[PDB]
Amino acid sequence: MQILLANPRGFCAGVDRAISIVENALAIYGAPIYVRHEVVHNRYVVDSLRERGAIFIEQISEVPDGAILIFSAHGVSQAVRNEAKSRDLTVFDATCPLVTKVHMEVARASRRGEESILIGHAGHPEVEGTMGQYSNPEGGMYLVESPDDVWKLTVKNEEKLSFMTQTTLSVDDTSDVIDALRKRFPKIVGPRKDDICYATTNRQEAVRALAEQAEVVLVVGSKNSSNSNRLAELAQRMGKRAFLIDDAKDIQEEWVKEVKCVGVTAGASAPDILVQNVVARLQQLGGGEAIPLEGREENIVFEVPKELR
Numbered sequence: 001m002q003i004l005l006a007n008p009r010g011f012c013a014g015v016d017r018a019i020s021i022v023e024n025a026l027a028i029y030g031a032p033i034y035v036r037h038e039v040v041h042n043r044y045v046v047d048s049l050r051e052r053g054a055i056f057i058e059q060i061s062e063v064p065d066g067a068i069l070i071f072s073a074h075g076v077s078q079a080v081r082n083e084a085k086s087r088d089l090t091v092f093d094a095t096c097p098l099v100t101k102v103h104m105e106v107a108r109a110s111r112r113g114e115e116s117i118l119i120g121h122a123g124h125p126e127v128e129g130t131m132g133q134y135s136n137p138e139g140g141m142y143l144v145e146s147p148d149d150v151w152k153l154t155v156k157n158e159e160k161l162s163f164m165t166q167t168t169l170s171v172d173d174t175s176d177v178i179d180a181l182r183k184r185f186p187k188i189v190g191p192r193k194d195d196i197c198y199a200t201t202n203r204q205e206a207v208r209a210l211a212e213q214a215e216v217v218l219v220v221g222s223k224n225s226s227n228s229n230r231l232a233e234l235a236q237r238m239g240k241r242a243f244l245i246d247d248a249k250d251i252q253e254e255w256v257k258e259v260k261c262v263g264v265t266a267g268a269s270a271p272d273i274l275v276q277n278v279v280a281r282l283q284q285l286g287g288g289e290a291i292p293l294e295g296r297e298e299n300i301v302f303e304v305p306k307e308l309r
């Protein structure tokens with residue numbers, strides 16, 4: 001069994017920054033450190049930070065007066081931010097800059113009372129954070145997940161309409177949604193393509209190359225990781241058996257039993273150690289040396305705020 005590794009895979013710049021933010025805050029202020037939502041959607045990262053004194057919460061009200069609070073990388077609504085500000089809290093913001101950039105455009109359209117459309121998945125914290133940057137009731141903010149959603153949407157003023165997207169979507173599916181938006185709303189404005197980040201684009205492209213070669217694809221990522229799900233989904237649509245797994249323990253022998261070629265990748269929130277352990281498990285099942293595929297070299301880094309060193 002050949003073991004192939006997708007390139008790129010694993011940590012993006014946003015995730016690495018956000019984790020370091022919580023780690024550094026723990027190191028300088030000691031435990032506990034309050035974090036609104038899982039800092040990134042990875043069970044190993046979160047349980048580790050929790051064992052080190054991070055307390056993960058959904059709402060500001062469960063955070064005590066005087067505490068240190070950190071927003072997760074997925075971002076937060078304006079309502080959340082102001083509730084946090086209104087309280088006696090010391091606030092660090094770990095939202096990825098690439099999320100913030102989308103937020104600022106939404107805020108712009110709000111100030112103008114001009115309607116905006118967000119392509120995203122309902123209930124996802126990044127969508128709630130992004131939708132929550134709009135508040136001017138003279139306009140509006142609408143969520144669409146699919147072309148069918150577009151085909152049902154009515155707006156107040158189609159001549160002044162803009163769109164934004166979640167950063168972790170399927171590149172292919174989002175192209176279909178945007179196509180629909182422009183056919184229905186010919187005057188709609190947006191970025192040149194979408195707001196899907198380099199990391200999401202790159203990892204989907206890399207899983208594409210991976211599954212052209214491999215018969216089975218293992219995607220390291222937690223169940224609530226949207227971008228990780230997109231990788232598994234992508235490979236499955238190409239007709240490959242593909243599994244989303246947290247660690248090597250999740251691997252069932254039947255999945256690879258008589259497979260000559262298995263591919264492995266990881267979502268943007270999964271640490272490399274999980275992949276090495278997955279590989280280690282595959283080698284117990286007759287896998288050889290892991291061969292990393294050639295891939296686009298990522299070079300972007302987001303520094304922690306100076307205050308956090």
Ligand SMILES: C/C(=C\COP(=O)(O)OP(=O)(O)O)CS
Nearest residue numbers: 040041073074168225226227269
């Ligand atoms: C911080 C973000 C993605 C990193 O991965 P994640 O699994 O933590 O988050 P989603 O993929 O958005 O679920 C959303 S911008």
Ligand code: SF4
Nearest residue numbers: 012014096098167197
């Ligand atoms: S996925 Fe893209 S947007 Fe989300 S954190 Fe990583 S880099 Fe930032």
